[PDB]
Design a binder for this molecule. Structure first.
Ligand SMILES: NCCCCCCN
Ligand SMILES: NCCCCCCN
Ligand SMILES: NCCCCCCN
Ligand SMILES: NCCCCCCN
Ligand SMILES: NCCCCCCN
Lengths: 316, 316, 316, 316, 316, 316
């Protein structure tokens, strides 16, 4: 084939070998890849239960359990395109602004090379430096799976950058197109009598958990696809969209959430869209249980990888 | 506008502050409040896996994650009515009858002041002294979420007070109207071929787990609303109604239970009933996993708080 | 009416007593029982995450929670037939072939006595020696719940015996009738774009997780029954069929799985079939969380026991 | 020598077999044994963190790791005398007074048969009913390893029976001889500014943690042997004597404790005394980490078994 | 005493009541107290494994186990002086400088009122704003128990503030007298071929783990007392001085440490010094096991409280 | 200063980067290195509690906390010699003899290149193939830290290869000189009166735990050095030598063991000896607690590395 390949499991047992994403070779140069698997070990944007800085290491670890071919779509992503583990974006645990700069820097090297990034957080603030690099020319659409909109304004006085502000920033900076943004799974007590105010004024489509239950998977999918249409789309997967039973290891859980099953069905349903990048954020190992949330992370990573592979091929 | 409010999360982070229910101020006088949040740290009635005496503390802890406004109903409970943390009902861990007296004494003051109690257990026996305080004037109706009927007679072999007997006592003492009692979620193997002896003979509506699946949420909700009518009604939520996946921290789990999502749907559907009190019972921290069951309790508590707040508002 | 009985829970509490299956007496002679509860503490067939050798002990422990009478069917299994704990099948943790030899040996003694076996694993390889003893005369039909087909050929060279090959082996050896085999819950990424090859060629009905969801419980059930028919049938239950939310303590978890509730419904729907034995495999205590998987295992064990008790009852 | 033996580890691996104490056969008749291994699954005496009721079960489990011969003394207890698992003493989890009565009942049957008990608690109150059976003829001496004196008077009013009063009761009842009591390891903040008042009035030798440190093992032992002399002596080992690092699974930890090493040395040095019984109490699985404390419990149990075996052989 | 007192355990069980340090009443005004118990829930200075922001809440929880009187020195701190829970110092989880400013501001009020602070972190950076409030008039002496000197210069560029720089800052700012600073337990691999460069150059007495082992407790103590003399001294206790076995719940563990016992002996031996404040830092619940480190923290707090109370009593 | 270096911690934080031993670069060619860090993830030799196959991945993860310079000895191993991560020796989870051949194959290539191996298991059986490669020309001496002598003969019939036989095999194969072999820490009950036969009859120096305590660290060190002399010597460090308090994550724990501190003092005292290689074995993640034992493994690995670096430097 000649593409980078995972360590062969008929030969090296899955517990063995240096833990890389999907057991792929490590790369330093983004031009060597069509899809780059990237860690963003960064949780400076976390105002309560931190720990998502350990997400990437543990996702790497549990991705050992992933196999080469998707059993539904039959996509063999490593055969389709050049995929590899591109390491961790530079992070500064003590300096939020420095991290923001340096992560953007890293991502514009990735974008300049033409690689589609598949990223593991890190809390949800990580998605902003990524959009800063990927949405310069044209604004992005987005399918966003989350318990929270992450479109708040300020925290603890007037700090504009937290894991709860990234999509407001991205919209203000013109990186995210709100008319092509759909959010799925929003739930839990809120600060305000009309929380979806910013959302409604700029026209974000918010499918709350309760609307997702009313609609069902198919109708929700039809509505997500309708919102993003034909244009360049990013997929942001916050593991907190899932119920705590499936994703305990997360900073801001809200009970009464999506099932793993349902998340796989929704992601699988995005086949054919022009996906320009994706992430899996908020995996927090210090609140995780037997690496349950790290495994969810790894699997959802692979689900997204398969579709990114197809978009990277189409884009070539 | 002058009601007790949670600590301001724009000022004081959720990991900070001495931990009270919902970050509310502590109160000793129930006349200061319309809805009172009360712990009953008591498990003297547990015949197997104990630890529910630690429930109220961990629920307080995890309730730090609750916010001011319900996202569906828009109810802002601390603006509608005055809510506060009344601390723990006094408990004697070595003397069961002394606990029964003292817990009731506490609830007697709460009832005299006209305050609706919202309680956290404690095993299910804690509901009895509450009913003894709350049901003397007219027998209460009840919506009861549980895996068990808790209507047994005697254990080992002349003891009338366990977590399995509170509602038999309540019916015998004329405090609980069985003809206005609905039990939802009952499941798990039983001791003898006829479990439902007492339950059927006094006319309790028992919606077993199986019937609840046949029925679905909306029809169950309508049957529960039919049974309790326009009369004064108590809501008892036993976390063991949930599947262990959502609530592992409980003494007597039975697999194949309710989802947190389903529980929220069913409790929200109780809107508008004449609710005179409610509790969340059987959270047992020594069997809990990373505060999961404590978070469930805290959230279900917030769900009940909203409905209780509306009742207390209608009374004023 | 002189049948072996569980310890009397109205006199001896569930935390007390030597842990045997279902708190029953221990037996060493299979002819003394119609249904024998057997542990197969064996995981030499495991290629990655091991630990199922500890399964039977923890299932013994957690089976303390089971009661005497099924609450839906009203089957009192210990009244219907003679049930007991037959101990553990002989295992050599260090010699795979010797274990196969000895496990088969033990199971032919069980078979020669007309005792129906209900077995707790152990990884899925355990089912092969059992099959070699139960299917010498006439091949078995099977209802198989798993995340994996376990019909692979070879591993790490020319090794034909792992937890992923037992049903391929059983079919080749004429012990399992593929035309009377249905498999339910298969999911997760695979090694090749053509995985169901062996299954499609010999005619195994494979119901993947995706098809189970499209089908629903009742239609899945009718299909399962259509496949096995009136003939002699084994039920093999691998806990990894369950979403890791319900069964974390297993070696090869795959997300987006079956709920505990669904498994109960599906197993309960096998009533009336000519069931000649069953097993519950792949419970791995070292990856379990507070015995949840061991509890699930004990419960499924009770569910199967009821059905088997009905089968043993019919014969005389 | 025709004496009961553990399952053969050279043949049956340690993860296998029904979990009895030391993998010994189970007995019903005390007269069949010279040393009886007994569980007392009782924690009605616990006023704060409970769970010791599950102690005997988890100790049975982890005793699977024990071997047949002591590596220092070379005592082979099963060769010397007849040892077996006598099951659990009857317990009433709801009724304290009924428990005391039924446990005594069980122990006087054990005593009437000339059988030396080796008991696993259960909280410390469990030793009282044992002393009530064993202390009738001559009052007993004791070497007692604990963080607390367990010689308090009343709790929560006029309650004379908790895990903190057994030894005061036993002295008042003339079952324990204070002049022949030595207590080793006492430490931790106290309620009373003069806590040791009772112990000093009746002449109990109290070697506090601080004094044990100054004395060292050899000299502490000389002093413990002096106190108990040649008379009949019980050993009561409370795991909370150990530092929480070695025994986390206990209800009332006090840091800065004894090491497992030190405890082994101290018990080993009691060889040659007339030991008429022993217990290991306060193992609390709900607060345990990976069965650490259960293992400690099982090992100390074996340490004592060897000594009790020598005393039993001496008498016969 | 008329002094504030812990909840009466003879009446109120230790698992009940809204949890405060040592079960004392909650205070808002530092002039009401002679020793103030304060939480600094702050870990913005943490460069790797964080979580210490949850320290104060869990130390509060586990301090429920503390009793009224020290069992060795016989000091009863609450009878000696007025002690209370002052709550948490204000903390900004996003703005490091804003926290430094606000924490100091809180301690300024505390110091102005003549109140002696006993603090629970939070990571070690938290000691800097404390020193900033306490060491302006005259520089402080210090006994510092730690695995690390915390006298490094810069991190990740020129960030002057981390858990590893605070004492470097305090010396530079004239708040700490290096000549009256002694550090005990220092150990672990270092970044650079010469580490104690700064510490030796300004003349801090550094007693590495190895020297403490050679010296022994008494001789270590005599050296520490020689260093601090008769002048005003602060005691800063980093739980990571302890072996991971005694304190697993900490961010930067180094194996082969001090035991709880040794730590208690070293603190007890500080009796009679002019102690003006103390802290217990680096308790990190997300890495803790069953609250082990919280309990150590709570107990070391009590050890420190007893001596602080005597100092405050001398002054009065 | 052209040697391989760990990721720069002033630039790249410890939670970031692909997890290699000590965050060194990954090598594939042994000839590139003077000291080779190797994982041997193999537990086929385990007769009871397995999981050591996961040892090397977790030790890699936690080795992230190691720094560049030994604080006592001042050895900067990466400046001294060329050190790197050689990956994992090949392993067949299902085939013991093939693992034996293939692991030896790998170490043969390592030995041919002049590279000193520093290895992480895997269970203690992993040392045999290592010795088979390193001990042909002349037999090795050994310092061996363990709770067990690992010189048993056969298990479960005649299987000559388990984690309890490696040194029996190595001695019989002329690879280990028993007259230059010292074992330290041996303890715990034994299977029969005469297991120890082999070790004494061939003259291994066996320093039991009891004797180690009698001798003390310094005299144990003197005796270990006397046994090995100036000849080529291997160090085999089994984490089960440590008390379970310090090393919970291990398959066959024996309470009453060495402390982390003692182990460090002992290994550090091996400076100057002709060390030809070392290993750290029996780290078993499925039994570890928050990675405690992996961290111990990582530190002991660093301690050993520093000494190995000196040996490599002298040869060159
Ligand atoms: N929520 C599912 C993630 C997988 C956890 C399984 C680990 N045994
Ligand atoms: N299932 C209830 C909530 C559990 C999530 C807790 C994450 N720490
Ligand atoms: N105190 C240590 C007892 C043993 C723990 C080892 C792993 N279960
Ligand atoms: N001198 C003891 C050093 C401990 C090193 C750090 C281990 N994690
Ligand atoms: N190392 C002190 C903590 C003790 C833990 C016991 C149970 N929380």
């Amino acid at each position: 084939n000649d593409h980078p390949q995972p360590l062969d499991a008929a030969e090296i047992p899955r517990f063995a070998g240096i833990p890389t994403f999907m057991r792929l070779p490590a790369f330093t140069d983004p031009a060597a890849l069509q899809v780059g698997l990237i860690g963003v070990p960064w949780d400076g944007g976390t105002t309560n239960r931190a720990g998502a800085r350990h997400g990437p290491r543990e996702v790497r670890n549990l991705s050992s359990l992933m196999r080469k071919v998707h059993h539904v779509s039959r996509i063999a992503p490593y055969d389709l395109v050049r995929v590899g583990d591109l390491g961790d974006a530079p992070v500064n645990p003590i300096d939020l602004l420095d991290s923001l700069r340096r992560i953007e820097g890293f991502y514009r090297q990735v974008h300049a090379a033409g690689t589609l990034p598949l990223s593991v957080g890190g809390d949800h603030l990580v998605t902003l430096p990524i959009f800063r690099a990927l949405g310069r020319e044209r604004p992005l659409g987005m399918v966003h799976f989350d318990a929270h909109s992450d479109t708040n304004d300020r925290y603890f006085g007037d700090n504009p950058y937290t894991h709860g502000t990234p999509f407001r920033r991205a919209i203000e900076e013109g990186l995210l197109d709100p008319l092509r943004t759909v959010q799925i799974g929003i739930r839990g007590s809120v600060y305000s009598p009309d929380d979806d105010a910013f959302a409604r004024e700029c026209g974000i489509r918010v499918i709350h958990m309760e609307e997702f239950v009313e609609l069902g998977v198919e109708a929700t999918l039809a509505e997500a696809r309708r919102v993003v249409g034909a244009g360049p789309t990013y997929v942001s997967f916050d593991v907190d969209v899932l119920d705590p039973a499936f994703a305990p290891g997360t900073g801001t859980p809200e009970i009464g959430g999506m099932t793993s099953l349902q998340a796989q069905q929704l992601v699988r349903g995005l086949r054919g869209l022009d996906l320009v990048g994706a992430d899996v954020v908020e995996v927090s190992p210090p609140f995780d249980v037997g690496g349950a949330t790290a495994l969810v992370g790894a699997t959802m990573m692979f689900e997204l990888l398969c579709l990114l592979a197809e978009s990277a091929a189409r884009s070539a």
